[PDB]
Amino acid sequence: GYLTIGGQRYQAEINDLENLGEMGSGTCGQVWKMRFRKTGHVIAVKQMRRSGNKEENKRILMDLDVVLKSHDCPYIVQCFGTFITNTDVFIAMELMGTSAEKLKKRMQGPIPERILGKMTVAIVKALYYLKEKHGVIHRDVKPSNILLDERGQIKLCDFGISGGCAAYMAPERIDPPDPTKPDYDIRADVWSLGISLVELATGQFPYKNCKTDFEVLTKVLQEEPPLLPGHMGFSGDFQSFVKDCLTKDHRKRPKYNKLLEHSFIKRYETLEVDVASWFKDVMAKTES
Incomplete structure (x- = not known):
């Protein structure tokens, strides 16, 4: 060894x-x-x-x-x-320490925007890295694949990292323009990020009481994209970031190289956010 x-x-x-x-x-x-x-x-x-x-x-x-x-x-x-x-x-x-999914459960509510800012910067840089360096499209971006630790680190998980869950599927993955060729691109994973951010920011998965996977797919296609609510004091940057990710027409959906110049990512790249202490406290005060 x-x-x-x-x-x-x-x-x-x-x-x-x-x-x-x-x-x-x-x-x-x-x-x-x-x-x-x-x-x-x-x-x-x-x-x-x-x-x-x-x-x-x-x-x-x-x-x-x-x-x-x-x-x-x-x-x-x-x-x-x-x-x-x-x-x-x-x-x-x-x-x-644990996944963002568990962290939402432990908190039984929203994760603070400032923690989600740091999370978005890390996870977009991971996904961009996977695509540019290895040609890998992740295909399963959801909160249970975002890991956080006591050191304040935020990382994309090893699980299914080579490239998932119907609930986070992009409209073009449900309704392919033409199945072949080729399939879809990283833009599908951008949508899933958007969904994950809304779920984490609000404390609830945005397609309500779906009894099956197919029912969520139906709501993805029939309904308006589920954006950040306007009554929660989210910053304009964050709302615009989510709205860009949740652009239903995939051709109009920005790729990572563009998302990385978004004000929400630029600001969080340099904002001092003490993710380690926040995480220790949440893990202290929790479980549920």
Whole structure:
């Protein structure tokens, strides 16, 4: 085994990791929280069993393949290394605090615009990075794929990172202009970002009481885009950013290179926002 962590590279075996308990399983599981005995760093170790589900393993490896290539992107969770035994692969990842989905649940309400500003800057830069550097279109941008930590970091999650959920689907993905060719572009992921931002900013998923996925698709197409409400004191920058992302006609929808010059992103690039303390407090005062 090989870990690159704390600025050094260590030869390591699975025995050098102290198991601190299971974190989760069944999607890109199974995930252990572990401590590296040579340094005291705590990490998340995802285990891919050789006897495990073939569709599950394929997803794990396609995601791992992107993560390994994105070491130079600070907005994407990092892989410290891998251990391959005769029966398993253990994948050592940066351990994050929780997802934005859970954070909305813990808070049972809106996340503050200032935290969402910092979130938008990070996640657009991750997505732009994935498209420009690797040609990857994420296809599943939603709050459960946005991770936050006690260090104040905000990152796009490793899960499904190689490129999802019907609820965040863009109108052109539901109603393709022409299925082939090619399919759709990064603009679909821009729409999903917009939906995620509205959900997080208001505390509620914007298509109300849909009983099925198909019902949300129907509302996406039949209804007006669900913009920030005007009675909540959102800044004009933020509303315009959401309204740009939620442009139903995809041809008129801005790409990342344009979103990155939007006033909402420019302002949040430099605004001092103490995401780490906010996150510690929310995690303190919570759960629900």
